[PDB]
Amino acid sequence: IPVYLKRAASLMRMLIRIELATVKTLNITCEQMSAILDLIRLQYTQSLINYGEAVGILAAQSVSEPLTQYMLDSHH
């Protein structure tokens, strides 16, 4: 695995190790743990950015939209 991809999963690894700690998963069966891990994998896959996204235009819109509100408080 490339190093940057390992760092990309650091936050999710942290969250999984916190919420799936042994103290927190005492009333969960092994098959239930498999289902939980499969659901986590599915949700992580569903959250990835699509290939060919115009993310630059998305960022331009998302940063230019607050600019009119920043103007609206120019007298403040």
Partner 1 sequence: YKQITQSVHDIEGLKQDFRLEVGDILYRDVVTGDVAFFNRQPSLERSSIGVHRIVVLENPKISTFQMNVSACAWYNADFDGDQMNLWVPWSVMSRVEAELLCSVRNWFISTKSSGPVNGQVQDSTVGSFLLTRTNTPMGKNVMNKLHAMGLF
Partner 2 sequence: VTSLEKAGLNAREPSNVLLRMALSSPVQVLTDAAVDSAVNPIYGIAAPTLMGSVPRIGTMYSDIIMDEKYITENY
Partner 3 sequence: LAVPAEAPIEIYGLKLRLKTFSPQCFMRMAEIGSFSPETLGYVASGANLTNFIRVFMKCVDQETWKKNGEGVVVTTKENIIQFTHQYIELYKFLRSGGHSWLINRLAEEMVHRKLDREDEPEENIKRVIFFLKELSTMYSVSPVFTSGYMPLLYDLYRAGYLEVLWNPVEQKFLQHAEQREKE
Non-local CB neighbours of 28 within 8 Å, separated by 6+ positions: 36
Binding mask 34-63 for partner 2 (x = CB under 8 A): -----------------xxxx--x------
Round to whole Å and give the CA distance between 29 and 26: 8
Q: How far is the CB of 66 from partner 2 (least distance, A)?
A: 16
Q: How many residues bind partner 3 (CB under 8 A)?
A: 12
The tokens for 54 are: 């115009």
The nearer residue to partner 2, 9 or 60, going by C-beta atoms, is 60
List phi, psi (to 5°) of 38: -65, -40
Q: How far is the CB of 56 from partner 2 (least distance, A)?
A: 9
